[PDB]
Symmetry: D2
Subunit: 393 residues, 4 copies
């Protein structure tokens, strides 16, 4: 309790320590659509990619709340860095569904091993002696250029080519080839490129069923540490939402910081703080961001409490969490629009971080697992026990 | 910790135990604009007016969170009862600013003593030998008909009639006269009538300065129990917001309960749950109510944590709480409008509780301490250290 | 053009002339759940129930825009009166789908004949020699107590009781029996009671198919006057939306009128107009009502233009109109909530017209033809040519 | 009437004719932050910069509604082009406040003369023999690189340097020097650079008082054509709002166009049109854009009607128009956020026009004359006759 809360405070302070390095690489990351080498070095030095790595492999092995709070503070310095770091942690946590052989191969001699993952089934696999032969093209591979391994979801087929089942497959960087497809107006430095494979061999021990990848059987396993009892897919959505939330909070802080030194054109208000319309409006916008913060924290706490108690979360609670994260990022994007209205035309200058937070948050917000409309339907459906409209929870 | 959480669960169960009595008196309360005798008996039997009464006087002496959770559940059975109960508790807590002589006179032989309070300075007082002579007319006296005492704010004047200062004055039912002025379309049974006084004597020991009434000096007093270190005015706003919130939650529960047994006219959807537009919309509306719940809980927790730690809350935190409560009730009134759209034309039948929750929540929401626009300006102003636009925090 | 615009100005002035009578009967209508005799006399004297009656029967024979503007002004004096008047006009227009024999029987010696109509198929009819035998129970019969005839939709069945088709059936007051079922918290004076029939004879000439009742074949008929080329069902939705809109505008006017003579509790603003937060907020709320006004006017103009040109409106335009009216009333209900926040706790006093407009608008807004969620789905579906989710347009 | 409506249809068709050229130059304009030469040639060939130029100088001399409708269609092809074209027309109209000598010098031998204008008083002027000496630095000079003249507002000072009054000053390209300061993430091709002047001579005939620049005395002048009776400053705000609106409409069209060929990740909906949540949500978003369209059209019509009738618009109507335009662009930015949610993660690819419309509309929306918060306060204040918070209407 006090131990896990103490660690959080230390990791938050690490983000502030290494923050200036991440901030310094923003301009280059914006140009190159890739995290600078100094940023990657800082991520490795800070151990911020190791929050959800097992303690037995030299990982920090924290909880959802801790990763969430770290994600929010990271976004102040660089949203792309925050997005990459949290996907790595999420991917590393999702890797714990694989056999020990796979985990030993990944983390055995690499405590700071970083994984990518794209869960869209964009490839086909066939059984071969000793494993599988995999072919596919997986887009939105966040941070793939810096990652050691990749978790790729694929559709198994027989000799005829008829679909038989779903698979989740762990494959190293040496077997990967990356196409340059990430040409966007937000989260540019994340380098979410397309992973390509053509008749790539993947052994049995690094392949699991799609069913086992989305399994929550470990929720009640007292043998495992609390972290690995956590609902992993929901946990990933929560920390991704935290990245977006953090950018929104940084945007709010900037607008507050600059408000006393500028006016509201073309009004008589030479100081934005002299306008009570501006001030009351900012109070409203802030409360929406505060609500988004409480949505993320509630979801994180629910996942942690269930993990520590070693109880399985029912579908209703998991569906609510999907509603929470979509709602939180939705509130942030609306709040960011209001903050642009507050700050003015100078928001859209390249020298101004406000448009940086605005663009990055909006791009990341439309990640599948953060879809607000899907979240509303999932959560609304939980009140009547309707069939979930998504495959995994 | 576990003790205070245990008590809450017991008091929540009392609300369910006595709930049917409150529910049974709804029709009469709606007619008579007054709480039925059976309801008042239940309030006295349940000890629900004694949550913020001192343990030394035989009170329960709970915290803000406990009163809040009790308020929310009470609103399911009768919002007017919930509104009256929470004002009594709030008034009883505000009475702790008076001298021991006053508190002994009120609570000494009456553990279940119930106080009214209206903080609008609607009267004038002059010094007389042994105390003051008070004259005034105080509207919105919630539950005055059932109360033993009343806390009335007044403006002190000299022999000439020139204003000299503010006063808070404790005066018994025997000295009170009540005008029938509560003719409303919501919270009818609350009986928020006008208190009238004409040259009424009030002794020194039952009069304090307006400054002392809004004081937070007791926040650091280790001699006092935690409850009386709590910021009382903010605590009252939080529990009033809980009453409104509870009605909104009861409205949501009803709409969920009835949804599978009705359609959406004039559409092809014979069942409301068959419409995914309805379901996703309900998920959205529910999340707004969930946000309002987290706003109230956050404010309650902040007040409790400060009280237990015996630390004074800074103005910024108090201004944020005023933003929280106004935002929460604002979200509830908007959510109620959405729930009427969900349920349909049958919402407005007198036999339907939905319009009951709708009307009661909306009426109570416009209590001064819950003003959403004031809350936005107070909280927004806290970011720049602007002068608060209200007299007390 | 100038002639039809001239008439509108005269009818708007009639509403102001007879308005005081409608306003005088508000208290009684609220008590009795029925329009006072003086109100019914004024409706008959003013010819306001005859706007959509044919000129050949001594009717005014106006257009949709004129009825809409009259409806909005009527709501200022009495929303229930406005709601009843517009339903009568709408019902009278819908009666033009019946044979000349029926129209002559209704309007032949009664220029000011008033019809009710409920389009929910709540009865069953069987063929009998010379017509049909009808049995059913039709709720929400707006203004039935004052009406001469009623248009009732029913499901035809054979001797076995198997459904064969839909019917629309015109039946006089002499054959009607009314159950007292209208016990509501808004639009009380409308007297929307349940119409009951038990083995009632209805002749051939006063019965048409449900298909013919929702027909728009007359849209291109140059023989008919423009009014009867109008899409009647859509026209009714537009004028019903105008009633709700008018109440919202009256609410806005009241808040503006009272703002300079009251403060914002518990703030330092003794005058509501001194608060720029209040003023800017009121400007926003007003613009939403202005948008709702333009939605209704656009729909009315589209229907009129098509009627005068004698061109048929395509489904896409009809689906858009259903989106317009639902959106307009949705904006008004949200705006009314904002106006209560603006005005304060005094809004909910029975002496205050603001809660009167608030309750009446909200109740009327949930009429099937004004369902905002249905309107959104209908209009959204028109972009892709999806099957409409409602039976008639 | 029919003549002016006929011309509009022809100019709308010109936009479609030259549209492909504007669309072809988008990529280069995005790179260079400047309109390509082919785009400038098309603007000159199409006469789209001459809509508000006088007929006596070979201009088209249209009205506000016509320029507005042209602006909306132009934004479909290139928002930057639309923004530049409408500012030129607006600037050319504002030039009609200058003496005939200035107008003859500008338009005498140049029917297609294009003016810039920045109305922020960013310079100081002193009287010199024959005119003034002007020094200043004017940012946000939209399309300055392609313009022949510039209208610059400045503060007149005496020999001591004490402020004496405001001036509006017409100065040619030959006397201008442009600093490269336009480095933005939206409306990049507009080239809104900083105009710099250092001791530049400006003769008497090309200088007017700030009072005369914002004058509406010509509103009743029957000698002038209707266009030059129009309230010029309000007219400019309306057409700027039309540019933003047009981008929003183009965004809506794209989302509708692409909806049937993509799904909603990670849901079971492989087609976006199969989700009724998506469809109803799109209907709602569309209606907000429709409301924004009616806001702009209402303002344009009010300005035109007053110009043709040669009546002066009162302050209340001008304040309402400022509310209309701010509200319209506010609805569009909110609608664009909803359209990104509808379309998904692919919205933010550089190849996708949706982010192009999103970025351009949001940047242009924060033009001073389009400030939503100022508009709300101006319009709200008009209900009580409060002093306007802006210098000119």
């Amino acid at each position: 309790r006090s131990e896990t809360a103490e660690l959080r405070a230390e990791l938050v302070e690490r983000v502030h320590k290494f923050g200036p390095v991440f901030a310094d690489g923003v301009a280059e990351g914006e140009r190159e659509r890739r995290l600078p080498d100094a940023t990657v070095r800082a991520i490795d030095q800070s151990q911020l990619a190791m929050l959800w790595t097992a303690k037995s492999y030299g990982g920090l092995e924290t909880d959802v709340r801790t990763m969430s709070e770290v994600a929010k503070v990271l976004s102040h310095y660089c949203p792309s860095t925050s997005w990459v770091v949290n996907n790595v942690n999420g991917s590393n946590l999702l890797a714990s569904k694989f056999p020990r052989a796979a985990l030993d191969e990944v983390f055995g001699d690499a405590p700071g091993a970083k994984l990518a993952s794209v869960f869209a089934a964009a490839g086909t696999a066939v059984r071969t002696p000793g494993g599988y032969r995999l072919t596919g093209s997986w887009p939105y591979g966040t941070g793939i250029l810096h990652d050691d391994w990749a978790i790729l979801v694929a559709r198994e087929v027989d000799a005829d080519g008829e679909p038989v089942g779903g698979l989740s497959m762990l494959v190293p960087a040496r077997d990967l080839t990356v196409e340059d497809t990430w040409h966007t107006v937000g989260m540019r430095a994340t380098g979410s490129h397309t992973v390509v494979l053509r008749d790539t061999f993947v052994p049995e021990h690094r392949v699991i069923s799609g069913e086992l990848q989305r399994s929550r059987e470990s929720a009640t396993d007292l043998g495992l540490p609390p972290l690995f009892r956590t609902a992993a897919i929901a946990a990933m959505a929560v920390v991704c939402a935290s990245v977006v939330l953090g950018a929104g909070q940084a945007a709010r802080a900037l607008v507050v910081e600059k408000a006393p030194t500028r006016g509201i054109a073309p009004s008589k208000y030479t100081r934005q703080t002299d306008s009570r319309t501006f001030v009351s409006s900012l109070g409203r916008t802030a409360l929406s961001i505060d609500a988004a913060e409480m949505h993320v924290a509630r979801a994180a706490t629910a996942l942690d409490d269930a993990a520590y108690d070693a109880v399985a979360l029912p579908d209703s609670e998991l569906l609510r969490i999907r509603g929470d994260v979509g709602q939180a990022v939705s509130l942030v994007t609306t709040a960011l629009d209001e903050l642009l209205w507050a700050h003015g035309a100078a928001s859209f200058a390249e020298s101004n971080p406000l448009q940086r937070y605005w663009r990055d948050a909006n791009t990341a917000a439309r990640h599948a697992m953060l879809n607000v409309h899907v979240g509303h339907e999932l959560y609304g459906g939980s009140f009547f026990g309707l069939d979930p409209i998504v495959p995994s929870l």
